[PDB]
Enzyme design. Structure first.
Site, PDB file in Angstrom:
ATOM      1  N   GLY A  32       3.290 -13.801  -4.294  1.00  0.00           N
ATOM      2  CA  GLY A  32       3.795 -14.849  -4.856  1.00  0.00           C
ATOM      3  C   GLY A  32       2.802 -15.681  -5.855  1.00  0.00           C
ATOM      4  CG  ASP A  33       1.777 -19.567  -5.319  1.00  0.00           C
ATOM      5  OD1 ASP A  33       2.657 -19.385  -6.245  1.00  0.00           O
ATOM      6  OD2 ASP A  33       1.864 -20.353  -4.386  1.00  0.00           O
TER       7      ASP A  33
HETATM    8 CA   LIG Z   1       3.688 -21.691  -5.306  1.00  0.00          CA
HETATM    9 CA   LIG Z   2       4.836 -15.458  -8.480  1.00  0.00          CA
END
Ligand SMILES: [Ca+2]
Ligand SMILES: [Ca+2]
Lengths: 152, 152
Positions: B18-19
């Site tokens: 994700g991040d």
């Molecule tokens: Ca985030």
């Molecule tokens: Ca992402």
DNA sequence: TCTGCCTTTTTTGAAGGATCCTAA
DNA sequence: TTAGGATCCTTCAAAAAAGGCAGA
């Protein structure tokens, strides 16, 4: 009530804490009893080139759907009962969005009583406020105080 | 080696997909033998109000550090040996960044013999190219073909 | 009435780099 | 020369809402 496996929920919890959103809204609406209604949404956003990842998530969760908004796509789950079942199982593994998920569950459980008392409705609207306070909220308009004003 | 627990790696792989970012760069610099060096970075970005999440990551990974950039902060790991140990363990659990992880591991394994011939430094540079292709690359400047200033 | 889905907008919070410094 | 850290920049890819329709 689908039961989700633990390794799935652990990875998904990391992914949600990163790219996902637990969204609670109050929407003005003259035909509901208190002239507003609640919306609760679990969302996972991803660039459309990786929409395949969201299509596989719909298969694995077994409910919800994927929509394109040009550049990006989102997995969305709103239906209240499956949303409850899903977040009940995910929330133990969440770290950034755990509080939001538990608020959503508290709202969902009090919904029945919310819809018959304006002060119970208001209290539930304050839990929505708490969700938005925990999120990176930037564009929010309708708040529990909007509701309180309008209730006359 | 530091041996990470499974539930930690599952959750972190979802968070990283994700991040996070697995970054490979070829940096021009006239004081290296081939007029370039390879730079490999594992990065997790988060809004500075949640830098405690990234600080915790330093403790759990047991190496790396956190840098404030104003509005956002980053956990960074680039020291080659622990980077290799960490990605080897995380790689199995990744779903969006698994190939990038394996390319970094592959590069790391060849580095020693890379700093000992043209043609094979250039070869490693194409493996950097491939990681950039897998990423959402938008501001990249120096590629393997730039490195054909090794031509004389 | 109530709910779930559809459409659209806002503003970043990420991602994914480029470039510069310095000891050993 | 080299590795690892420090400063910086670009461009989104996310997040987190808003508003509306209509079948049940
Ligand atoms: Ca985030
Ligand atoms: Ca992402």
């Amino acid at each position: 009530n689908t039961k989700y496996n633990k390794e799935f929920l652990l990875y998904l919890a990391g992914f949600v804490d990163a790219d996902g959103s637990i969204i609670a809204q109050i929407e003005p609406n003259q035909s509901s009893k208190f002239k507003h209604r609640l919306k609760l949404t679990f969302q996972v956003t991803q660039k459309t080139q990786r929409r395949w990842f969201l299509d596989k998530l719909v298969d694995e969760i077994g409910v919800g759907y994927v929509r394109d908004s040009g550049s990006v796509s989102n997995y969305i789950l709103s239906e209240i009962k499956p949303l409850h079942n899903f977040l009940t199982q995910l929330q133990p593994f969440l770290k950034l969005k755990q509080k939001q998920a538990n608020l959503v569950l508290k709202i969902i459980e009090q919904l029945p009583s919310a819809k018959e008392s304006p002060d119970k409705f208001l209290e539930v609207c304050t839990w929505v406020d708490q969700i938005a306070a925990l999120n990176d909220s930037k564009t929010r308009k309708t708040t529990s105080e909007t509701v309180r004003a309008v209730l006359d």
